[PDB]
Symmetry: D2
Subunit: 298 residues, 4 copies
Amino acid sequence: RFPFPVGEPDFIQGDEAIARAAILAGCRFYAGYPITPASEIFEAMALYMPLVDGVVIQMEDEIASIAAAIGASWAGAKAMTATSGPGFSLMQENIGYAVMTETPVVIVDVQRSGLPAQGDIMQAIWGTHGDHSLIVLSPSTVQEAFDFTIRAFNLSEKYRTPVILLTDAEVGHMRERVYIPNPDEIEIINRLIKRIVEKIEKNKKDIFTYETYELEDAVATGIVARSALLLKIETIWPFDFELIERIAERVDKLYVPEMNLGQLYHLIKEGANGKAEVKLISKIGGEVHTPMEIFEFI
Amino acid sequence: RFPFPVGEPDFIQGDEAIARAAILAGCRFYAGYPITPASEIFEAMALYMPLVDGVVIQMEDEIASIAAAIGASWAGAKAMTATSGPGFSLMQENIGYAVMTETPVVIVDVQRSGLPAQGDIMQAIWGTHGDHSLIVLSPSTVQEAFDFTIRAFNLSEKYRTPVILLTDAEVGHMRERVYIPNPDEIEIINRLIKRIVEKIEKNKKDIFTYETYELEDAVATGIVARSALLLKIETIWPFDFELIERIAERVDKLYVPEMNLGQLYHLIKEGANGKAEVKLISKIGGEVHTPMEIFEFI
Amino acid sequence: RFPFPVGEPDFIQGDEAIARAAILAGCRFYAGYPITPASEIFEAMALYMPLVDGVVIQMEDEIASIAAAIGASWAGAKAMTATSGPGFSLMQENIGYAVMTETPVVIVDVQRSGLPAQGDIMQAIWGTHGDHSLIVLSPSTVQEAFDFTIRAFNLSEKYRTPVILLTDAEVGHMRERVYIPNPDEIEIINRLIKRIVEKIEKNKKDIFTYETYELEDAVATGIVARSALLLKIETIWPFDFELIERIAERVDKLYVPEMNLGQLYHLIKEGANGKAEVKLISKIGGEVHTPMEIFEFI
Amino acid sequence: RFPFPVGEPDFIQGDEAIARAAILAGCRFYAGYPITPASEIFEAMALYMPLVDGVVIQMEDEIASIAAAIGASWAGAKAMTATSGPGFSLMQENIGYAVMTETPVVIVDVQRSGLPAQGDIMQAIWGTHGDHSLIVLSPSTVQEAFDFTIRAFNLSEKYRTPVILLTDAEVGHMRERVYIPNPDEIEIINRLIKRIVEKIEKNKKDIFTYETYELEDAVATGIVARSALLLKIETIWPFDFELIERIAERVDKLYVPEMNLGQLYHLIKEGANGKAEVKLISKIGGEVHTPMEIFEFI
C-alpha cells in the first residue's frame, strides 16, 4: 500500500528516488530539516511517510537530527537523516558514536557548492574521531540513488553499521528514468574496535562495487561519471586498493576527474602502486565537467 | 522479572529510586551521560536496563541526549534523559520541540550548586521558546522520587507531553526508605498551540498535587520541604494559583524558603492576591536550610 | 566617518535602525546568521561594518554565534549577535555563562510566529540556568529600536552584563521616522552571584524605564503598544513591581494585551498586589492587535 | 614579566610546556574546558594567564569553545583552544569555517584511548567539510611540544590559517627537560578557496619539517618516534609526498608503527610510489610501542 508508483518505470528526481527507495526498504523514521538540496528529500518524506504509518521529525539541529535517528534505531526503527555541507561536519561525533555502538542508520550527505560539488569524499571516510570503519556509496544516476539507498539500508543492517550515501545537488535535482520494482521483488535484510574495523574492511568483496568493462583501453564517481562517460566508483569506502593496482598495470595513465582539489585522486594514486601515472582533472566552482573539457585535457 | 527488589521496602538513594521507578513504569530507553549528580541515575540504568531488554545510550552532547529520546519515543519507546545545570539549558530547544509535537518523554533535572540548590524552578517552567505548557514535579523524599517518576511517565503519556522531574543533588544522593510495589500493583498508562496549552492548564485539578493539612495555622518544595517540616509544593507546573489565594486569606504571613534568590516566591506572591504578606528565606551557596535557620527567621 | 546618514531624520526599518545604532554605539563585532526576520540586521551589518573597520562573522550555529561574541568581548570588542525563535533557546547556556562572567554583550531576539509574536518574554527573563540577573528592553517604534540599542550597549558596559533587546518581526521590518544624532551628541559608556543579582535588581531606578502619563484614567509592550495607543513597558527586566502596584490602586481594571497566552500578564498580576483586576487580551497566530479589537474588548 | 621560569632549562610536562610556549608566543586568549588529558593545559593557563593580563574562558561546549577563540582572534587576540576525542569532532565545522575566513587560531587535539593513542591523524587532515588546507604538527618530546606550539602560533599568523597541534596523552603528561628561552630570543610573527589551498600546499618547503639522518640504512610520529628510536614525522600536513618517494628508493622496506589501524601508513604508501614495501606495526588499546615490540617485528 505505497502512496507512489511501484512495479513500473517512472521519471523522478534524485531526492525523490532516495525518498521512495528508503520507504520501500523499510524506513519509518526520517529526521531532518529542509535545506537545499536535501529539503526535497524532506518534502518527499513529509509527504509520503505519514501515509505509510512512519514519522518525520523536523529538527533544527543537525546534531539533534542524527541523534534522534540513532535513538529511533535503538528503539527498533529503520532510520535516516540527510544533510549538506557544514551540517555534515556537525554530525561527525554522533556518526563516530554510531560506529562504536554498531548502530544501523543511514545518512545522506548531499554535496554542494557555496550547484553540485564533490568536496566531502575524504570527510565521509575520515571525519569520525578514532579508528572506525563505515560504508560510503556514491550514486551516478537517479536509478542508482534509488538502488543504493536500498543497498545502504541493507548494508546498514547486515553489518550493523551506519551507511553514508554520498551524493550531490545535481543527481539530487535532475529528473531521470527509474524502474521502481514491486515490494516483493526487493530483498530487504531484517534486523572491540578491532572487529568493528574488520567487519567492514575484511568484506570489501561484498561491500565494494564498481562499474567498468574496458579491458582494451590505454576513473570518476557521482555526477562526474556521467560526464566522463572509464572506471566507475560506486562504493567509496571500504575501498578496493588492489583493484586499482591491477588496472594501473594494464594502462598507461589514469585520469581522475573530480569536482574538488583532489580526494578521489589520492586513493587512486595510493591504489596505483606506482604502476601508472595518475592525474586529476579538477573543476570546482559550479558546473560539472562538460565532456568536452574532460575530452580535451586527455 | 526485575533485577532489583520489588513488592517490599528497601533503602535506596534518589537516583536509584528514580532509575528503579522508571523501569517499572515501562521505560526501555535511557539516554544520558555520567555527570554529578545524575551520573548515579546513569549507572543504575546502565546496570539494570540491559537486564530488562532495554537500552542505555551514552551520549556526549545534552542536545543529542534529549534528541535521541524524542527519537526513541517516536519510534514507540517510553524514554528518559537526565541532566544538570547548564546541560539543562542546552536541552531547551528540543524540549520546546517535544512540546509542539506532543511527544511523551521524561526529563530529570538534578539541581546543583557550583551540593544541592533550587535555582532551575523558573527555567523549568519558562525556558522553552514560545507559548507552551508542560508538567514539572518536585520530589521531597526518596519515596517521592520513586513515585513521581512513575507519575511523570504516566502523565507524559496521558497528556502526550514532556514531563520534567525537577530534583536536587541531596534528594538524589540521600538514602531513605522506599516501598517498591509489585509490578501489578502499579497503574501504568499505555500509549494548535492553543489546545496544547489548554491540555495542561485546563487540567490542574488532575495534574496539580500538594501536601499540607494545617487548617489551624497562622510553603516549600524539594529538599527544603523536609527541613521546613507548612504547604508542600509537589506539582510545580501547571500551578494552582487559586489554592495559594485561599491559603493567603486564612493566614497572616506566608514564608517561602528556597535555595535560590526567589523563584517559588514569585508564584506565591502572584498567587496571594495581596491577601497575605509573602516573604522569602533564601539560602544559597551549599547547605540546605537547617530547620533552626527557618525556625529563628520566623 | 559613517557610511549612513547621521545628524538628521531618516526613514528606516527596525533591523536597519538597530544596525545603525549599534555601530554608532561602538560595536565592531557582529556575529550572526541570515534568518528571518534578523537576516536584515545581518545584511545591514554586513554592508556597513566593513566600512567602519569592524567585522561580521557568518556563523552557522547559534551556540557558536553567541560564543564568538562573548569571545570578541573578552578580547576587548563591543559585540552583538541576533537570533529568532528556537535559536534563542540554543543561546541560553552561553547567555547564562555571560551573566556569571559579567560579560558585556548585546543580544537581539527578534520574536516571530511560525509574522510577529510576543512569546519570548518569560524566556528572555528566566531561560538562563540558576540565579542571575540581566537586562531586557522592548522597543515599540523604529526610533526606540535605534535608541534602545544604544542604551543596551551602554547598560551592557556600565553594569558589565549581557543585554537583551527583545523585539518582534513587525517593528523590525516596518519603515518609520528615526532621528539619527551626530556621533558626538551620543553619550557612550566606555569599558559572587549575590552581588551579580544585586548589581541589576538594586538599580531598577536607573535601568527601569516606562512611558505613560494618564493620571486621570479608569499596559502593553512592543508592536502592541502602538496598537493599544496606557502604560508603556520598555524595560522588561529588572521589573518595577511597586510601580504596577501604585497604578493598581489608582485604577479599576488593568488590561494587558499581548501576542502570547500570558507572560507580561503574570508580572502585572504579581505587580498588582490584588489592588486591581488584571485581564489579558491575547491574540496569537499572526496579526497584531487591531486597535478596534483592543477597543471592543474593553 | 612572566610568572614561570624563562631563559633556562626546566623540567615540565607536555601540557605545561604547551601552556608556557603559548604565552611566550603572544596568546592572551585561551578558551577550553577541563578534560583529561587537556585539563592540565587548562589549569596551567588558568594559573598563568591572569598574571599576564590575558583571559581564560571556561566553556562547557567544544562548539562554543572554538567559536569564542575564532571570535577573540577576529577582535585582535592571538587565541587557542584544546580538546580531546569526540570533542575534536564537534569542532570540525568551526575549524572548517576558520579555514575559509583565513582566521589565525591554534587548536590542540590531545589524542587518547577510551592512555595515549594516535587515531586522529586523518581526522586532523580531512575532518573539515569541503576543499581546504590547514597545518598539522606532531610533537615527539616535551621540548617539541613547547617548540611546535611556538611554531603553530607563528605559522597561524604567517599563513593566516588555523593550526592544529596534534599530540597525545603521554607526551602531554610526561615530565622531561625543556630549555625555555628568554622572550627576546624568540622570533614571533606579528599579525578564493583555490588560493587558500595553495597558500599552504605550495609552501611545503617552509611548513614541512622532518627529522632523520640515516642515509646508510636498509618512520613514526609523536610518542611513537621516541620508542621507535628512523624517519621522524613532525609536520603531518601539508605533507611532503616526494620526500617519502626519495626515501622509498633508497631502502628496501618502510615500517610505519602507529597507535591506530593505519593512518600515517596510508600517506606513506601513497608517498612511496611503489618503490618500497610499506608495512604498519599497529598497536592500539593503551601502551605505546615498547621498543622490544618494534624491534622483534622487524
